[PDB]
């Protein structure tokens, strides 16, 4: 088990449903940083459009993995965010700046088809 | 039975009513008017090529020929019968045949099909 | 009842199946057939949207596509639904919805849409 | 008498089998490859388009749709009716009209007519 | 039984005629006009290239041959055979063989072939 | 739960982890099926690269599943098959035939560009 | 001593005359094939214009050669069937597909030599 | 007796059997197969050019052959023998020499060597 | 019964095997011109490869079925003459001149295109 | 096992060496001159990819360079191994991997790879 991901031409999809804790990041986050290495990518498309609920812990990761992986060498664009997480849980109580952010999946992997040239 | 038609060639809706002279129509005075927005129907054809006859509700049908008027547009009668329109009361556009009023729908929103 | 709604928009002919779950309907097969050499019909649609939970009609409702390509020129079932397709207990060319299968069927008898 | 037809304007051949539904009929069979090589006939069309009805055996009408592939080019069974593909379980490309039928097997040989 | 030929490749209408040279078959004289008014054949041809012979029937052959002439148009016998045409007690257009029979036929219709 | 389905450019991109049971693959057919309606999509990538050994009658219901598709309106490519599954269950008298399997999913869509988009 | 076979610009055309049982059929299957391999070929022509009666024992050794040399490297053809022979052909039943037979040795030719090196 | 050798020019690989028929020998059934995902080639060969004779392998070697389309797709025959398949009990693309199978097995995958 | 003809184009061709007596030849003889009247031709091509020896009143019936053919028309090519037939034997009365030899079948044609039908 | 290895492209004929590492192995160069006058022989690749290691016979395996160029044009020594040339107790073109040893093996025939 665990979290998937899948290489794209010269570019990094990965699907995200309904993970549990900080616990679940972590397991998430060293199987994202580790075949990014394997991988020669330059996006990494974060697709989490199916979740219901995000926990504050988890806060400090996926509002902190975008500070993980531009120091590792790939654009991140955080795309599918539903509107229940949104509102109050990437409230103004974090530094959510510089991120990228997109709606759908097909707009989102056209925003980093113009990052690779075309 | 409370079924009768309904379509989609991509702009319009061509419709077809085979042979119910009642006051069932009481189901395609509804249920066409709420496919108008279900999806952007700008034509719509009715095909009333079988059907004989029309006893007592055209006022049910000139309605229905007047509501998506006033809701997209271009209600078009096809294929009167010498039987069906012996008295008329009571404009609307209609055509002759159901293959030319397909090319007339393309003709009022710029279309025309070559090759 | 007495009633499947056939006729030609195009070259091509338009038929529309509703709820019909019925294996009495075998004149689905007979009655179209009769009106498909009646004019010149080189290709035709099925568009059966919602017929959901369809025993063994297949001895008929695949035969019968059989024969249209031994009458005339290809056939093209149109959307079928979820639980349709898995009824599979044992080709022929299938499609989306009617308004991309009859695009495709002009891309056969080498027409398109223009402007 | 027993005998149907043979000419031909030399790249097709045309056939004409009106109505005689018996297998003692075997000459359309027989004397149908004897023609094949008395010219250089080139794919044929069979137009059954009155024969009602073969009911148990089709195997020398369709069988010998086999025969003139081996022997020539292919052949058409141009126009069949409807009771005849009522339920044919037992491929071999067909036409509907004897002017269509020439068209699509003319662009088999690489010609048409056009001016 | 009752039945001598007929056919539809094109707008030319042609017929053949197998050996059966009687005055019984004054239907041969009406076949070629009942199926000639109906569908629309400028062009007509014989082809009679197996008949030997006829005995007292040009009456209800080529007398009657101009008769298609206030029909539609040309009548063309298609190689009426040696011993055929010996003396005769009796103009129209004829031709030699079918293959170049027909060659002359789309030349009246003002249309050609291409390779 | 359950094993998802991302639009991407008219395309499905179908990723699967370690299912080696059918009665959880006829639990998840249906999510092929139930979103090919909703999104008019023209061709499925199944990736089955992370799935290590299959069982026989999955293969005679996953060997279907391209019937599925192929019979819904709209093609399918089963990208990077595992050398162990075609030489311990496909030499099994099952009937693989006309089915357009890639080798990664790079030239999957490299393919798939070559059923929509000239 | 044998069925006369010679040889054409990157062809071979092969003809018959008349047989004897199947004891000439074996020796014939054993002539061909290691004549296309004793020199190099890409296409068969086999005349069988003057035969008018073939034994089911027999058929299938025009039905080896017209396959086993499919396999061996080169397009067959078997130009100008009897119409006698053609009926106890399929009256037996064999399909003869991707044979493309024609009606005489000259216009046997004409497709051969267009199809494979034009 | 090892192993059998196998290296690329970069879009195929080459591979050679000398006489290895017996069925333990899987090796090259196996580490063949292993390569395919090593480095991804999409043509392949095999060059049993110099191998007399196939008794105990029938199937399996061509079965393998068939199952290389799910990853690679389709590998090429190279060179069978007269007494390979003189005779067999019973599809597979071939060529007759390395010669000629590598220059149209890069045709299959558009490339070219032109001075 | 052995010696074939398998006209191609106008241009007829003679495969001859290994022969015993001259009693073959007259029954052969006639057949070659037998065939230039059904047919029309341009030039017969003998192929005489096959022979090693040759009886005396054979070369007199070779030597003249290259006049009897040059008087319906067509021109004659006697092609592929092996060492030990040509070295010694056809040192005998003939008169051979006008008569094309060539080398193999192949290029025997080319040698007769090249002069006549093209 | 009468053997080394073999192979045949299309005009630099190549050859593979497996591990076979040992003085009783000179058919590796027995086995290669008999191929040089069995056809032309340009330029031919070693290929000794798989092989560690080998110490006891370089007089073999490097003087034969100078062995096939005075009998047809050179060879090129393609991919020695790591810790197989550290062994250097005591020239040729030669180059590391197989799929670029034709990149300039096809250049000195005037070939070169388009498209």
Known sequence: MGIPILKLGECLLISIQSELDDHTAVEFQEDLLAKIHETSARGVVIDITSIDFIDSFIAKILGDVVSMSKLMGAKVVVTGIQPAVAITLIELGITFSGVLSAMDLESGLEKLKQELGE | ?115
Request: net charge negative; charged share 20%; aromatic share 0%.
């Open chain 2, 1 to 115: 039975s409370a079924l009768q038609e309904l379509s989609a060639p991509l702009l319009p809706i061509f419709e077809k009513i085979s042979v119910m002279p009642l006051i069932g129509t009481i189901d395609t005075e509804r249920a066409k008017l709420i496919i108008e927005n279900l999806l952007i129907g700008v034509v719509k054809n009715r095909s009333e090529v079988v059907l004989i006859d029309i006893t007592g509700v055209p006022v049910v049908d000139t309605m229905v020929a007047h509501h998506i008027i006033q809701a997209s547009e271009a209600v078009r009668l096809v294929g009167c019968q010498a039987m069906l329109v012996g008295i008329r009361p009571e404009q609307i556009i209609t055509t002759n045949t159901m293959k030319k009023g397909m090319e007339r729908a393309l003709a009022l929103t710029n279309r025309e099909i070559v090759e």
